[PDB]
Structures are given as C-alpha cells and as structure tokens.
Symmetry: C3
Subunit: 186 residues, 3 copies
C-alpha cells in the first residue's frame, strides 16, 4: 500500500500553508501545524516528527524517522533541500556544560537554552542519521555525509563529514544546470 494523507485530509490539518502534491504519512507526528508551512511536491515519510515553527519549500523529501524540532525560532528549508532517514534538526538545545537544569520538566528560569533559526539553503542534502544544532545555516548546495554532526554554519558548495563535520571536498555545481533544465519543462 502507502501511508499518505489525501489532499482532502491535508486541508483539514490546519497548516500555516500547504502546497500541492504534498504527501505526508499518517504515521508521522505533526505538532503545532498552525506554524508549519510546506511548498509543493514535498514528501514526509513514516515516523517523522514536526514540532513548532517549520517551513519547507518545494521538492523536498523528509525521509522516515526524521525529527524537526522547529521551536519558536524555527527551521526553514529552501527548495530542493532533502533530508535522509533518522536525521534530527534542532532549533533549540539544552545546556550540557553543567551550568543549567534541563528539558521540559524544569521551569525555564533554571535552564539555559541554546537557540537560533536553522536554515537549509537550496540543494542541501543531509545524510542519513545526522544531527544539526540550533543557529546554523547549511550553505547552498552543501552535502553532509551520513552519521554526521553540525554545530556551525557551513560554507556553500562543499561535502562535510564526521562528528563534528570536517570539509572533505567540493560539491559539483551541476545540480544548478539540471535545476534550470528541469524547471524549464514544467
């Protein structure tokens, strides 16, 4: 079979805005859809979680198990950005240093949250099993390899790997031509 909402059920969800050809699995979780926005030709697979301010452009695959903890400051993805399975992107994290208490259970005034908008520029691919922390921009046409971790903004058009990531080599810009060629025949 397949797991997706129909254009009908989509509409009843109460999204800030949702495009056309949007396939979201009923096996995903959508928290606070009133601030979640989806452009066109998007797919979100089983067991993803979207919570808080999330904005996705058009022609993005969010693969299974991927969590987007958009918070109040948000996560945004430009067009042709894609995220492989089991990725987490965080717009807000707790403070591990030992200088604060943490998580939901604890009153704000004792915490020390790290928070910043997270943006994923065009043509970003995020490898399977990766993590992106708050306040970072992943640069235009960056690929980040599998099982990688990102704590900082990434320079455009490079491939990064590792925990935390290191720049391994350039990203081909050939996606750009194709983007245009594809867009042409629309």
């Amino acid at each position: 079979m397949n797991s997706f909402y129909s254009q009908e059920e989509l509409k009843k969800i109460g999204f800030l805005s949702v495009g056309k050809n949007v396939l979201i699995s009923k096996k995903a979780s959508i928290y606070n859809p009133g601030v979640i926005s989806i452009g066109n030709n998007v797919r979100i697979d089983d067991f993803c979680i979207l919570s808080g301010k999330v904005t996705i452009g058009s022609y993005s695959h969010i693969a299974a198990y991927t969590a987007l903890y958009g918070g109040e400051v948000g996560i945004e993805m430009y067009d042709f950005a894609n995220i492989s399975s089991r990725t987490i992107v965080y717009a807000a994290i707790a403070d591990f240093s030992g200088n604060a208490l943490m998580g939901p259970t604890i009153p704000n005034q004792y915490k020390n949250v790290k928070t910043g908008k997270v943006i994923l520029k065009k043509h970003v691919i995020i490898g399977a099993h990766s993590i992106i922390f708050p306040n970072v921009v992943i640069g235009e046409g960056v690929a980040v390899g599998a099982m990688s971790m990102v704590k900082e903004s990434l320079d455009d058009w490079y491939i990064y790997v590792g925990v935390p990531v290191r720049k391994i080599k350039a990203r081909k810009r050939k996606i750009v031509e194709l983007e245009n060629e594809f867009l042409k025949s629309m």
Copy 2:
C-alpha cells in the same frame, strides 16, 4: 494537540508504579508495564520503547525514538537524569564474537547473553543517537555527547564523547546549587 495519555488512561496500563505530572505518548510502546515504576514529572515522547525492567525517577525527559530494553536485570535512572532522542540503553546484549547464536529466534543454550544492570545517576544526560551497553554505571552528573557509545561505567561529573567514549573535560557542578535553589522554593 499532544499525543499524551490522560491520567485516566495511564492507570489502565498498570505500571509497577506511576507518579504525577507524567506524560507518555500514545505513540510510544510500553511492554511489561508491571515491571516499570515511574516517578513524578516525567515525559516520554513518540516512538519510544520501554521494555521490561525499567525504573525511572522524578523530573526526567526521555526523548523520542528512545529504546530502553531492561529485560530482567533492568534499567534504573535517578532524578534529573535525561535522555535525548534516539538513544538505546541495553541491559542485555548478544555475544558478537562468533562463539554464540543470538536473538529471540534461538534457544538460550546456544546463546551467551551478556547481561548486567544499567544505572544513570542523578543529573546524567545522554545526548542523541547514543548507545549504552549493559553493566554500566553512568556516574552522577555525567554528560555523554550525541552519537556516543558507552561500554565501561563512567566517572562522576565528566564529559565523554566518541565511539567508544573518552573523557574530555569536567562537567560544572553549579546544577547542584540550582537543584537546591529549586527544590527550596516548593
């Protein structure tokens, strides 16, 4: 909207025990509820799996996709200990050496199950995508980085990172004061 049980439904699950202000997603999986006790101010998110022997104290977040398999020896977590998304704590793990058959499709004679209780002491924080193997004491105040793997027990108030983890710096103890400051005003 949230996916959590009403206190009504909670009790019709029947845990060895279960405190108050305890939010557990309906999208989580609780097996063997009668071997799980749960304190107060505790939250378990979508897609988690609790299995068998699990003891959770008070003031704890267990983030989504987290699996606690406590089989018979169990997992025990103190107060103010937290677990980030997508972690596994294993109280029992198969012998990988070549010397044994494995998993639930096989009789136990042909198996060499390494088992051993897992404890996470006050203020432990496990970061996301982490694994804890059996027979491990995560000392009080220990922070383990995201995408870390833990085989040995670990020293109080330190920060560990890697696969397998290694010690990289002392955790601050100021959270001691804040615990106090905080329980103080109740």
Copy 3:
C-alpha cells in the same frame, strides 16, 4: 506484545511467508507482494520494509530498522540478524552534485546508485548502522554498532567504523552450534 495473528498475516499478502513469523503491527510493510519471509522471524515496532526484501529463517529485525528493497532487493540468509535502528539501502541518490535527488524529481535528472544487498549466513549488523547498495556482507561477518558499510565485506570478520574497517576474525564456533540446533530438531 505487538505482533500480527497468524490470521492477520496471511491477510497481508506477502509473496511468500512461513511459520512462527511474528511481525509487529507498528512496523510498516510496503508492497508485501514482493517480500518473502522464511520461518522463525521477528520484526519489531517501527521497522519499515519496502520493495524487494527476501528474509530466510531464524532472523531478528530489531525495532526501527528500515529495509529499502527497491527493485533490486535486499536478501538475508538464514541466521542473519539486524539490530535496532539500522538502515539497508538497495538504492541511493548520488550525493556528488552531479544529479538531483528524491521521489519529488523525475527519473532522468537523478543518477541513482543501485545493486543487490546480500546479508549471508550468520551475519550480525550492530545497531544504528547503515549499509549501502551493491553490497555483499560475507558469511558470519559482524559489523559493530554505528557502522557504515559501502563495499562488500569478507567472510568471518568483525568490522567497526565509518566507514567500516576490518578489526578481527569472527569465530566459527557459531557454525557447530548451528549444526547442533538443526540436528536437535530431527532426533
């Protein structure tokens, strides 16, 4: 427990399927008509099977494991098991910047990497691991946890790392044990 009844299962429509095959109701099966399962097989909560998967016998597919069979398929031999939160890909999008990617985009603009994934006998894949397309995991190999595998792996070794490196011989005791269990089945 989570599993489908024997009645519930023959209702899914698996190409083939055997007996004592416990499958969680919280796992996701896609195109069951191209998925054969042997006997004594466990698939836990939140797994995803999609496309050509063949699984033999005495196998555990731990919680959260995704097997993306595609056309080419993923094949496991008997006594192979996979641990929680693993991903097996028989197809994957070229990352180089030489092509677009995803089901959002028409086939011509992509440069999809494809190939059979075979998990031979006694294979054990550790937890949180990723295995790529066109990859033969050799007989009685163990890959550790959090491991990444992009090329074929030689018989009877332990492998760890991202990407994997060979670390030690895996012991073959397991083969005698196998025989002993199989005989104890007969007499």
